[PDB]
C-alpha cells in the first residue's frame with residue numbers, strides 16, 4: 001500500500017494486461033486449463049502419429065494454417081508450413097499488442113519496424129511455452145495437441161525444429177508466470193534499445209525503464225515468495241536469443257535442402273539481415 | 275539482512291582487489307590521463323609494436339622460437355596467453371565467494387570452465403575505451419584501429435569486444451559493482467553438466483540480492499541499473515559464442531607442443 005509512483009506502475013500493468021487479453025486469443029490461463037485436462041468441454045484431440053494426424057485433420061478444423069494445397073506429400077513439410085502461417089498470425093497478434101504499448105507508436109517509424117523485426121520471434125517463443133508441457137504443444141487455438149515425440153521423429157531437418165523450444169519451455173514454465181506477468185515482460189522485450197539499426201535509442205530506453213519498473217513491481221506483488229524472480233526472468237532473455245539464432249540457422253538449411261518449398265514473405269523479411 | 279548483504283559486498287570487493295592486479299579505477303585513471311605522468315607505451319602501428327617489445331618487454335608478445343615472425347598471429351596468440359593468465363586470477367577470486375568451495379568439486383570446475391570467458395570480457399571492458407585497450411598490466415596501450423588493421427580473420431577479432439565495451443562502460447559501474455556482478459556470472463545454474471544446481475542457484479540468489487542493493491546504494495540516480503546490467507549477460511554470451519567461431523576458422527585454415535597444452 002504506497003505511493004502515486006507505484007500507482008502509475010499498477011495502472012500501466014493493468015493497461016498492458018488488458019491489451020494482452022484483447023490481442024492474444026489463447027492465453028496461458030486457457031492453455032493450462034486445456035492441458036491440465038480438467039474439464040470434459042475443452043479436451044483436445046491428440047496427434048502422436050500418422051493415423052492420428054490423419055484423424056485429427058478430420059476432427060480438427062485447421063483453419064488454413066497451411067493455405068490451399070492437397071497433401072504436400074510430406075507430413076514434415078505440411079507441419080512446417082503450418083507452423084509458418086501460424087507464426088505469421090502470431091506476428092500479427094504481437095504487432096497489434098505492440099501498438100498498445102504506451103509510447104510505441106510515437107517512436108520513429110523505422111525504429112518501430114526495427115523493434116518488431118527483432119522482438120517478435122523472441123516473444124513468439126516466450127508465449128509458445130504457455131502452450132507447452134514437457135510432452136507436447138497445443139495447436140489450432142487449443143483444439144489439438146501434438147506430442148513432442150511425434151515432432152522429434154519427423155525427418156532429418158524438421159525432426160528437430162521444435163526441440164530447442166521445448167527445452168526452453170520446460171525451464172521457463174518453472175518460473176510459474178501468469179498472463180498478468182507475461183504482458184509486461186513481452187512489452188519489455190519489444191522496447192529493447194540495443195536492437196541493430198535503431199535511429200533513436202534514448203526514447204526507447206526511457207520507455208523500457210518504465211516498463212521494467214512496472215514488471216519489477218508486478219512480480220513482487222504477484223509472487224511475494226519468489227526471490228529474485230525479476231532477475232531470473234531477465235536472464236531468460238539470453239535463452240530466447242539463442243533459440244532464435246539456431247532457428248534462423250536451421251532455416252538456412254531448409255532453404256537449401258528444400259528448393260521446392262515456399263517460405264512466407266513476411267517471415268523472410270523479418271529474417272533478412274537479422 | 276541488508277547487513278549481511280553489505281558484508282558480502284565488501285568481502286567480494288576486498289577479494290576482487292587482491293585477485294586482480296589492474297582494477298577499473300586504476301585503468302580509468304590511465305585511460306583518461308589522471309595517472310602519474312608515466313604514460314603507457316602506445317602501439318598504433320608495426321614500428322611501435324616492435325619498440326614496445328624491446329623497450330617494455332611486454333610480458334608476452336612472447337618471442338617463442340617455433341612460432342613468431344608474423345605480427346597478426348603473435349598478437350592473437352598473445353591474447354590467448356594473457357587469457358590463460360586471467361583464468362587463474364578469476365579462479366582465485368571464485369574460491370573467495372561464500373559457498374563456492376563447498377560445492378561439488380565437479381560443479382566448481384564446470385562453473386569456471388563456462389564462466390571465465392564471460393568474466394574475461396566483462397573485465398576487459400574496464401581496460402578499454404572506444405580508442406584502444408590497456409595491455410601488460412596497463413604498461414601499454416594498443417590502438418583499436420591498429421588491431422582492426424590486422425588482416426585475415428584477425429583484424430576483426432577484438433572489434434566485437436570493443437563494441438561490447440563501449441555499451442557496457444556506459445553503465446558507469448565501478449569495481450565494487452563489478453565484484454558482485456562477476457560473482458553472479460560464476461554461480462550460473464544453467465551451465466551444462468552440473469550435478470547439484472540448487473546450491474548454486476541459492477548462492478547466486480544471495481549474490482543477486484547483494485548486487486541489487488549495491489547498485490541502489492551506489493547509483494541512486496540511475497534507474498533500473500540492476501535490470502540493464504543483467505541484460506548485458508546476453509551481450510557477453512553472444513561475444514563468447516562469436517569468439518568460439520573465430521577460434522574455429524583460425525583452425526579451418528591458418529597453418530610448441532607443451533605451450534599448446536597449457537594454452
Ligand SMILES: CCCCC/C=C\C=C1\C(=O)C=C[C@@H]1C/C=C\CCCC(=O)O
Nearest residue numbers: 065079082083084086087090124139267
Ligand atoms: C500447425 C501445425 C502444428 C505445429 C505447431 C508447432 C509450432 C508452432 C509455433 C507457433 O505457433 C509459433 C511458433 C512455433 C513455430 C516455430 C518456429 C516458426 C518461426 C517461423 C519460421 O518458420 O520461419
Ligand SMILES: CCCCC/C=C\C=C1\C(=O)C=C[C@@H]1C/C=C\CCCC(=O)O
Nearest residue numbers: 352353356357360394398409410411412
Ligand atoms: C584479462 C585477459 C583477457 C583480455 C584480452 C587480453 C589481451 C589482448 C590483447 C590483444 O587483443 C592484442 C594484444 C593483447 C595481448 C598482449 C598483452 C596482454 C597483457 C595484458 C595484461 O597483462 O593486463
